[PDB]
Design a protein around this ligand. Structure first.
Ligand SMILES: *C(=O)([C][N]C(=O)[C]([C][C]([C])[C])[N]C(=O)O[C]C1=[C][C]=[C][C]=[C]1)[C][N]C(=O)[C]([C][C]([C])[C])[N]C(=O)O[C]C1=[C][C]=[C][C]=[C]1
Length: 215
């Protein structure tokens, strides 16, 4: 059977969102992993609140930045994250307004992935599901991508600036690839997604800041 898994066609992933002018890609990513696990456990997908993370994870910078692990730690220590209808995305920073009633998910910790480990990452996405990863997105070839398996010898594994979410992997045609869910509306890349090279020596440092929440 094909060495591939694509969570989109299993109801594990939600519609592609646009982050706007807010640097909350880390919030979208975190929430993306939370939704994947939700579906795994409860069997039903629901849209979680990225804004809830933006305004409440004080350990992070809000629209300035943040780490997914910090957002995980928050849903565990606060025990609950609202749904989108319970705490809509306003495209900017505002006072934390967690509405306990609107809670739609919980998590009991989180697990990282060995820095620079693509084999282990494959195993995670295969075993656990949608993993939150961070890559170097500061590159024009990446931004105007439209189709195919993305690869550029200048993607810097040391400059992780954009958080994203791995929804699977595969071989489009000869080339191994990580199926990525970006957060720049669905007008970007291939309807919101982008296939990135897999096994071509830790391309873009996709496996350097990976993690997954435990549920
Ligand atoms: C993300 O939101 C980061 N934002 C983006 O990558 C881009 C910015 C652009 C300059 C490429 N997107 C953006 O601004 O959206 C605008 C837009 C919307 C729709 C269409 C087009 C454009 C938030 N990420 C962070 O804050 C990250 C967190 C993780 C990557 C760690 N912070 C970061 O990378 O800096 C700190 C850091 C230090 C050490 C190691 C890793 C990270």
């Amino acid at each position: 059977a094909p060495d591939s898994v694509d969570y989109r066609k299993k109801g594990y992933v939600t519609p592609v969102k646009n982050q706007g002018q807010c640097g909350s890609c880390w919030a979208f990513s975190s929430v993306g992993a939370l939704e994947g696990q939700l579906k795994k456990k409860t069997g039903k997908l629901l849209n979680l609140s990225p804004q809830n993370l933006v305004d409440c994870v004080s350990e992070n910078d809000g629209c300035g930045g943040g780490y997914m692990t910090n957002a995980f730690q928050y849903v565990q220590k606060n025990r609950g994250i609202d749904s989108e209808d319970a705490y809509p995305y306003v495209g900017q920073e505002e006072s934390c307004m967690y509405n306990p009633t609107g809670k739609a998910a919980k998590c009991r910790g989180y697990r990282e992935i060995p820095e620079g480990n693509e084999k282990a990452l494959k195993r995670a996405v295969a075993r656990v599901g949608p993993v939150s990863v961070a890559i170097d997105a500061s590159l024009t070839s990446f931004q105007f991508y439209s189709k195919g398996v993305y690869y550029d010898e200048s993607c810097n594994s040391d400059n992780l600036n954009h958080a994203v979410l791995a929804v699977g992997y595969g071989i489009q045609k000869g080339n191994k690839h990580w199926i990525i869910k970006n957060s720049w509306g669905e007008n970007w890349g291939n309807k919101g997604y982008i296939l990135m090279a897999r096994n071509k020596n830790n391309a873009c440092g996709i496996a350097n800041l990976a993690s997954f929440p435990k549920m």
